[PDB]
Design a protein around this ligand. Structure first.
Ligand code: MG
Ligand code: MG
Ligand code: MG
Ligand code: MG
Ligand code: MN
Ligand code: MN
Ligand code: MN
Ligand code: MN
Lengths: 386, 386, 386, 386
């Protein structure tokens, strides 16, 4: 029942199932996982692929020969399992050198080092077949007002992404970039804090067609925002290149619960939207099995991510296919929302006396929207109570 | 001491000092103010101008002759006082007809009526000399997931703003539009919920140069966002057309406290930024004198808005002029943040062995950023403790 | 399917289905409901009873004869339908006189008036058979720090509740009090903001056995708190006298959505707890049908409150009855949580070398808690996916 | 200017200035500090004393002889500097064995070990002269609903604190306990999440006079609560045994900024209250110098904690001493808030026709509270603008 297959395109970061359970107040509760073992275990669960930061796969400061060894072992596990690598990213946050940022660090020599470390891993991602390269600027930001001039930092952020775009085009690489927003943590405030800020910034890059967003359920919810609404705006702009799925219980620290935990109805409306819109990218889980769990709990949590997606997919499809729901959607005038307000044009609107002079505002005000009956049909569908 | 003059460009909405104190749980505590009396009282306090919704100035459903009478009375008070009207906006939220929105209402005939009501007031704003026309889509949004297809709604929102842009260009009007974001309240979630979402949406309009943002302190803070950071991004994009100043205590209902209340250090960093960047638009207060107050309290609260701006302006100027602060900014490498990361270009960066192969990451990691000493110099300046 | 009967003890406030849809930004969208019509409509839906504020039932400032007329009409509808009145409360928030509070208003004469208005309605509630008298101190609090000395206000709050307790005991009334906490709105901060603060305050009253709490789902969630956890603490103290059920989407204005909307998994864990603990008080809905709805939407929303309770009751019962869940609970040592840590006593614990000197902390640390498999069994049960 | 002396009773935890800068996303940026060096550096800055967890002072798993060595070195530094140790606490959160809690872990043998580890450190704290023993239950809680039966956990929490009270009374120790609440982080929800929940729980302990609260600025603000209001309630109950001072920017991860950062006006109202109430306990800083800082930044941040307290103390004293403020407080009827509502008693209130039958509610409603003029006098005082 609800069993994933690789055609469901479920992917996981190496850092997710491999999180050792170090949090700000506590030591690791689990041993390190060898990436090869994660690939094999995830393949057995029905995953389609894995993702990585450079430093997940190649220990920081590895020699060039150790580096090849690590990559070759990893390549063999991908070949043995059929697993793909659709996304890769750079760790620009763990090492102390990045304590004030990578691309927007105040120290210029750190910024140059951040760019070189990124470019090296873009080459590796292309060689492994990644289509999307994610940037999460977790250290770009500030705890205090005077520490970061945000206009200068946005100049430096645009400089860095423009150079990366020049690099991939000059190499002929078929890879796109996706910015992963997060509003805070580990910095007091992070630059480009939401999907909207990231989309707006992309429009000022030299080659905006190369850049999209990689939104994460829990991150938008850390600002109290509606995640399906943000995703709909990203889809509307043609910029949903990738997505991070997980769970979050409101405005607090980044929990990274398994997908379906946290705000369950928001998960339902997210799956409805992704499936209706024909999103065809990876269904990626950026999640942390809680540090209460041993390795059996890690794999149960990973399996639950995909199970919950597949249950919600079924319930959302049943909802949209239900004749009674389709009648309710017309009762609530969703059909009218999809029609142009004024395809007849400005001048026709200005001369149309039924739009103002003879508009019966009181009759229009009296029409109920029937949204509550519609929402309870959606609840009944989610719960399998019809 | 700290006395405003009209050259400080302080402005107030008629609805601010005129708020009667009706909240969701309580009746009005103050009588209605005649707009003429507000103009005179605000002029005496040192205000530069006032703003209005159509329905603040002309009671909803007024006949064409009553309408002229109301406008003429208002015009006379502006002439008697020297007060300007730099901004106007449309009430598309109070009347029951707008219960599901104006521009993105599901009912098409409401959307057409919303546009006609807006166009009528644009003509009036131009006649009164307004430079900026604000749109706050307070009813555009939803309480439940199925009620609003957000892609269709964004289509309708873009349709509405494109028609308004076609209207002002066809009339030859020298007016620009500013979208005022708000994340929630009165709708469960509002479309374009933050400065970032609004900036991103503007880039998809037919004539993006006509549209900017009118951010409000308290609204970004209702999503827990850093308001000076958002304003810096708006300035960076060239889109800060107008600003709403007030106070808010965190993530809760929209409080609209007087400016300087709420997050006081954020107010300090906001004034520092506006003054450093040479923002030359109106300093507009979108605030509500608490319903505990009588009319003497209303004017004390209005006066406090401008007093707090002028005190913070002095402290921010003293901060930036202090030699010890300028030395601290260099100690924290804000000068280096302003320098290009790689003006030498991509190829030079790729060949620069000091950027990677011979970069001493450990020496760079060991450098403190000296941000705490800088922040305490900013605290001492704010408090007048130096 | 899932049809309520009066033995389910579902109750509604007159102010809930009768909310006209006035919010801070908008006029009423629905006409006023006659209380008699609400009683009849709710009885047809399967409700067990209704609740009221004094001013819902008797218009403010009614003459003594109008007052009797209103009560007699209401009594007749209760007799015609079989509806009960298990709870009543006082409106100490709508009238302008209460703009700074009722029991903790700075003006002494307002505080005395607040007490007299309350006592009058206690007599009426007893005559209608109410077992619980609720106090929601919505105006008790402040927007600014100097306006309210909170120690003096707590003195005044304790004075008011002590007098009410002296009044009911001197009259021989069999009624108890329940304080309904709320953290903010309409005041910037409200006194006794959470279930915990209210429970702590009760312990300083002269006769604490007379006072309990009436927590509301959405109010605890406006502080980001776990509502089932708070209810468990109230049950643990023996103080859950009444409960308000509704929905809320996180930290924002008080939404009062229908129960089951908002945080659906929290609703599941709440129903599990109430049913497991044998809570036998009313299942009261303090909710507002959204102002998008006409009267048919009002009754659909009311019906959905009880439907969602009954669906969640079934799923929680199925969860606890499942042998596989009972095995998982033992796997996660919930049985051990219920056993005393040290029934052998302090001295035995101090001499027990297996508790410290010879405790194998590393073996104990290695035990997984199996919480994720348990939580996914709870998800499968909630969704009907087993 | 604003220089602390040991009579200001400023104290710091060893873990504060000694925080190495490991956060969930990043390695340590600073080396470990020897406790002896912290004591000497803090003494030079004007601190009065230090606090510790057992594991800060004695590395976990130390032999009994290493333990004595560590204590003796520490004792010598206290003797050389005059520094006191007024508070101590237990680390029941770092080691993996505590991943599901100490006192409320599901595993019984962990709970017994938690108690033995605590008792051992109580003996050490008494020997060092500590008056207060703090308990922060950072691991007591849950990420999912089924993992923790909260009634059973509260039984186990009460069992643990009752045993500790029996232990200190049987030994004749003159030490009191203080519970430090926190709503979340590192657990998804923590038990006893606010000052109110902790105060309520204390009233069910066997010997409630032994237990008080140790509230922390940032923790109450992580639930969006008003921290001066919570402290006033703790003072009102006679339970403010200790306090943790720091800064926090709203509802997000626990930032532990230096005191005065975060919500500056809340810091002003906190200092006003502590000084007015004659709080005579330690002014303890539970803060983390940001990981951007080197060791010079650590000591600058520590110094800023005490500087900001002393500046706010001066401004609050000036505020309360100002004749114009004292007149404003009477104008806003704070004098009337301090007077009994009904010292004449219930029967006199019931017969007093001026309290209801002849009360002029409209005249009373018309009185402004003059709270805005009062709040602007407080702003002017805080900023030194008078
Ligand atoms: Mg992510
Ligand atoms: Mg505004
Ligand atoms: Mg309620
Ligand atoms: Mg603390
Ligand atoms: Mn995350
Ligand atoms: Mn606002
Ligand atoms: Mn509510
Ligand atoms: Mn903290």
């Amino acid at each position: 029942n609800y069993q994933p297959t690789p055609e469901d395109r479920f992917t996981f970061g190496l850092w997710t199932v491999g999180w050792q359970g170090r949090d700000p107040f506590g030591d690791a509760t689990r041993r390190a996982l060898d990436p090869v073992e994660s690939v094999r275990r995830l393949a057995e669960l029905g995953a389609h692929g894995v993702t990585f930061h450079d430093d997940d796969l190649i220990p920081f400061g590895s020699s060039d020969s150790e580096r090849e060894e690590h990559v070759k072992r990893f390549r063999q596990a991908l070949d043995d399992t059929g697993m793909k690598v659709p996304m890769a990213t750079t760790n620009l946050f763990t090492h102390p050198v990045f304590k004030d940022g990578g691309f927007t660090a105040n120290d210029r020599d750190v910024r140059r080092y951040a760019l070189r470390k990124t470019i090296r891993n873009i080459d590796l991602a292309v060689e492994l077949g990644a289509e999307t390269y994610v940037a999460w600027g977790g250290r770009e930001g500030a705890e205090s007002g005077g520490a970061k001039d945000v206009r200068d930092a946005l100049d430096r952020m645009k400089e860095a992404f423009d150079l990366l775009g020049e690099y991939v085009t000059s190499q002929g690489y078929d890879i796109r970039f996706a910015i992963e927003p997060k509003p805070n943590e580990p910095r007091g405030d992070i630059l480009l804090p939401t999907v909207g800020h990231a989309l707006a910034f992309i429009e000022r890059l030299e080659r905006p067609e190369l850049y999209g967003v990689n939104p994460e359920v829990g991150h938008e919810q850390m600002a109290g925002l509606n995640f399906p609404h943000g995703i709909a705006q990203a889809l509307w702009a043609g910029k949903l290149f990738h997505i991070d799925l997980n769970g979050q219980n409101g405005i607090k620290y980044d929990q990274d619960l398994r997908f379906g935990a946290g705000d369950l109805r928001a998960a339902f409306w997210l799956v409805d939207l992704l499936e209706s819109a024909g999103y065809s990218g990876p269904r990626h889980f950026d999640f942390k099995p809680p540090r209460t769990e041993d390795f059996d709990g890690v794999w149960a949590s990973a399996a639950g991510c995909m199970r919950n997606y597949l249950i919600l997919k079924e319930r959302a499809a049943a909802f949209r296919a239900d004749p009674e729901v389709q009648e309710a959607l017309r009762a609530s005038r969703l059909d009218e929302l999809a029609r142009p307000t004024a395809a007849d044009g400005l001048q026709a609107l200005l001369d149309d006396r039924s739009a103002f002079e003879e508009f019966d505002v009181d009759a229009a005000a009296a029409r109920g929207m029937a949204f509550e009956r519609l929402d309870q049909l959606a609840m009944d569908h989610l719960l399998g109570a019809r």
